[PDB]
C-alpha cells in the first residue's frame, strides 16, 4: 500500500510515527521503505525494529493475558479469541520474516547490518515459538536457535564485546534458552560471560559508548537476579 | 517474565 | 463484520478485550453488539463508552502530537500524515454518532439511558469540533452544544445532583465551554454550581455511591484550580 | 489540557 510513496517520506513518516505512538503506522511505513529494495541504513535499522516489537509486544501483551485466563478456565469465546489475537500475532511475525528474507539478510553484508537482521530473524521466531503447540513447534524453536547462533558467530568473530547490537542479541538468546528452550543452564552462562566480557572492555569506550553498553549489561544482571 | 532488549 | 456472532459472545468478547487492552478490538465487537438491535444495558453502556474512548483517546493524542510539530513547522509529510490520522479520528467519531443515531437514541426512553447517549453524542461532535477548520465547524460546535444541552436538561430534572452520569455530563460540558467554545467564564460557573450541588447531595448516598460521586467531583475541582 | 471524564 506504500508502493506510491518516496523512500524518503517514508522514513520521515515512520520518525513521526513514533513521536505520536502510532506502531502500526511506524511499521507500515517501514515496511514500505524496505520493500523499495534498497539496503537499510543503522538509524533505519533500529526504526523498522522500534516499530514490529511495539506493535508485536501489544499482542503478546493481550496473548499472555488471555492465554493466562484460558488456563484458569479449564463456551468457546475465550478460546475463541485467544485464537485471534494468535492468528494476528502469527501474521505480523510472518510479515517481519518474509522482510529479512525478501531480501535483507542476503544484501546485508557487513556484519553490523547481517548481525542485525539475524538477530530480527531469532527474535520473531522465539515470539512464533511462545504460542506454538503442533507439528512445527520443535522446527521453529530450531530455527530461533540457528538464527541466533549464526548471528553469535559472526559477532564474536566481528564485534568488540561492548557493542550494543552483541550485547542485546547475546541478552535475548538468553533469553531464547531460558523460556523457549528450557536450557536455564545455558541461559545463565551466556548472561554471565558476556556481562563479564563487557565488563572487561568497556575501558576502551567513551563515555557515551560506555552509556549504550553499561545500560544493556544491567539487563544482563537484571536477568542473572532473577534467575540466580 | 526476564528481560529481553527493549528501549 | 460481526453479524454471525451472538449478541452475548460479542459482549463477552469485549471483556475480555478490555483486560488484554485491545480497544479496537473491544469496539468492533460493541458495535457488533449495537447492531444486533436490542437496546444495551447499564454495563453495556460502559463498555461500549469506554472501547470508544480509548480508540479515539490514542488518535486525539496523536493528532495533538503531529499539530504540534505542523504549526512549529509553519516537504508535505507532516501535513499528510497530520490529515492521515485526522480522516481515522473522524471516521471513528462518524462510526460512534452513526450507531447513536441509528438506533440508540431514539429508543432511549429511560434517563439514564437517554442523558448517557446524548452525552456520548455531545462528546463525538466536541472531538469533531476539535479538528474542523471548514465551512462546518460552526455547525459542528452547535451540533456539540445541542447534544449536551439536552441532556442537561433531562439530567437536570431527572437525576440527583450526585449521579455519575449527571457529573460527567456537567464536566464534558464545562470542558466544552471552555476549550470549543471560548466562553471560558461559562465553563467556570457551570463547574462551580455542578460541584456545589452535588456536594449539597452527599448526604444521601451510600458509601459506594459517594465514592464514584467524589471521584468526578475532583475532576472538576481540578478544572476549577487550573482555571482559577 | 483540562480534565474531561476519565476512568
Ligand atoms: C537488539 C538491539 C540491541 C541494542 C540496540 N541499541 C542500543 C543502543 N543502540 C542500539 C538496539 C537493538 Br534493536
Ligand atoms: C461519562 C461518564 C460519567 C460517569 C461514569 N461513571 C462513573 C462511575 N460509573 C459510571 C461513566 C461515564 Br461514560
Ligand atoms: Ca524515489
Ligand atoms: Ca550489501
Ligand atoms: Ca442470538
Ligand atoms: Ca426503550
Ligand atoms: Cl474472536
Ligand atoms: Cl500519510
Partial sequence: ?228 | RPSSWRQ
Fill in chain 1, 1 to 228: 500500500a506504500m508502493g506510491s510513496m518516496e523512500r524518503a517520506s517514508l522514513i520521515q513518516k515512520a520518525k513521526l510515527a513514533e513521536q505520536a505512538e502510532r506502531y502500526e503506522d511506524m511499521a507500515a511505513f517501514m515496511k514500505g521503505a524496505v520493500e523499495k529494495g534498497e539496503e537499510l541504513s543503522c538509524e533505519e535499522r533500529n526504526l523498522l525494529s522500534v516499530a514490529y516489537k511495539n506493535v508485536v509486544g501489544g499482542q503478546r501483551a493481550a496473548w499472555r493475558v488471555l492465554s493466562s485466563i484460558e488456563q484458569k478456565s479449564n463456551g468457546p469465546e475465550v478460546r475463541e479469541y485467544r485464537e485471534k489475537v494468535e492468528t494476528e500475532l502469527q501474521g505480523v511475525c510472518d510479515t517481519v520474516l518474509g522482510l529479512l528474507d525478501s531480501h535483507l539478510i542476503k544484501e546485508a553484508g557487513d556484519a553490523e547490518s547481517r548481525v542485525f537482521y539475524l538477530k530480527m530473524k531469532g527474535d520473531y521466531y522465539r515470539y512464533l515459538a511462545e504460542v506454538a503447540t503442533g507439528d512445527d513447534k520443535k522446527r521453529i524453536i530450531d530455527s530461533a536457535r540457528s538464527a541466533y547462533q549464526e548471528a553469535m558467530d559472526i559477532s564474536k568473530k566481528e564485534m568488540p564485546p561492548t557493542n550494543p547490537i552483541r550485547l542485546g542479541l547475546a541478552l535475548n538468546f538468553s533469553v531464547f534458552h531460558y523460556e523457549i528452550a528450557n536450557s536455564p543452564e545455558e541461559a545463565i552462562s551466556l548472561a554471565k560471560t558476556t556481562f563479564d566480557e563487557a565488563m572487561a572492555d568497556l575501558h576502551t569506550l567513551s563515555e557515551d559508548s560506555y552509556k549504550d553498553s553499561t545500560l544493556i549489561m544491567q539487563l544482563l544482571r537484571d536477568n542473572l537476579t532473577l534467575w540466580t
